[PDB]
Amino acid sequence: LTTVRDACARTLENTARTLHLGASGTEFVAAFRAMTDHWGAARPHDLPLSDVSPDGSPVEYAVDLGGLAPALQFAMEPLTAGVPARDPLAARAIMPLLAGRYGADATRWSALADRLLPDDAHGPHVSMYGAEVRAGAPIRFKAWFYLNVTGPDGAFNLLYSALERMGTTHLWPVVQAHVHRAGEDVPFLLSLDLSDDPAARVKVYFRHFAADVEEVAAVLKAYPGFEPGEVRAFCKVMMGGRRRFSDQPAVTCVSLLDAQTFDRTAATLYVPLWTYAEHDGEVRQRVHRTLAAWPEALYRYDSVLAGIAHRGLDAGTGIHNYISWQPGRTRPRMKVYLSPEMHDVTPPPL
Structure with a gap:
């Protein structure tokens, strides 16, 4: 009988406690509640299916795999029971809420929303928001x-x-230069950091449809730190030795300003995890191989995963959504993106 908004808030709270986020974690859970209050008393079956997670869950959790001081993040979709996800009303309410309650910057949001959050969107989804x-x-x-x-x-x-x-x-030249596989490399999401602070970025997500790993490593080789050998190795390990993105495409995120400057790294590679493995136990094995040199990162990863999974990992896929890779000062920065499997049900035998 637990509502979606309470179930997710509890999962986020437990994960924050596992990461020892302290007071920052408590305030983070309160911000999550502010953003998801509008889900009302809906249970999972009451909400529209979401684009946030491939299994339709309206929230996705992400954690830093490495480094002291891990970051915790969520993404969610503004949704109302009985209303199609493409309806823009819920998304239009989030920005004034964040601006008013948290001092988030709305100026760039407002410049885009009239056209990117229209009343009659062509696609099935029109908005996600998140925090970290x-x-x-x-x-x-x-x-x-x-x-x-x-x-x-x-x-x-x-x-x-x-x-x-x-x-x-x-x-714009950043976008053109990321344009290799014309027709196959396609921008499909734009993200805005809702701050005025100097670190806020506009980012563009690209899909690499029907690509093999070497080709993806070429799109990215232009960005500092994206050593093709290290990139190919990350993909091949996390895809169980597959050399091509057969169905589910590789995704890259380009921070436009950072690609044009020099001091910050400007691209992130996202590898999808739920279609290139037999089950989440195999995905976990690949993460342990990938993070073998850092037993503490693995203990943390296992602790976060165990608090978000609510079935045996070997039963199938659907918990691990993505793992991302970005060059770091001394080591790569990797994040894992996890689903709560909100809508899964297992009826008793007939």
């Missing part, structure tokens, strides 16, 4: 917009128009 926190640091909020709201062939037009509205068309 580390112990002792302020919570950072973000929004994702869909580049398909005017149909499939409008993503580049919509993206260029968004940069124009934000006064950053000087960033």
Whole structure:
């Protein structure tokens, strides 16, 4: 009888406690509640299926795999029981809430929302929001917009128009340079850090459809730190030795300003995990291989996973959604993105 908003808040709270986030964790859970209060008393079966997780869960949890002071993050979808996910009302309410209660910056959001959050979106989803926190640091909020709201062939037009509205068309060459597999490398999400602070970024997510690992390693080789050998190795290990993204595509995220400057790293590679393995136990084995040099990162990973999984890992896939890879100062930064399997049900035998 537990509601979605309470179930997710409890999972987030337990994960925060596992990561020893302290007071920062408590305030983070309160921000999650602020953002998901509007889900009402809905149970899982009352909400529309969400785009946040491939299994339709309306929340996804992500944790840093390495480093002291791990970050914890969530993404969610504004949703209302009985209302299609593409309806923009819930998403339009999140920004004034974050601006008013947390001092989030709405100026870039407001410049984009009229066109990217329209009343009659073409695609099935129109908005996600998220937050992240580390112990002792302020919570950072973000929004994702869909580049398909005017149909499939409008993503580049919509993206260029968004940069124009934000006064950053000087960033467009970053997008063009990331354009290798024309037609196959496609921007499909735009994210905004909802801060004014100097670190806030606009990011573009690209899909690499029908690519093998070497080709993906070429798109990324242009970004500092993306050593093709290390990138290929990460993909091959996390895909169980597969050399090509057969069905589910590779995804990259490009921080436009950081790709144009020098001091910050500007791209992130996302490897999908639920279709290239027999079950989440095999995915876990690949993470342990990948993190073998850091037994503490693995203990942390296992602790977070155990608090989010509620069935045996070997039963199938659906808990691990993605693992991401970014170059770091001394070591790569990896994150794991996990689903609560909100909608799964197991009836008794007939």
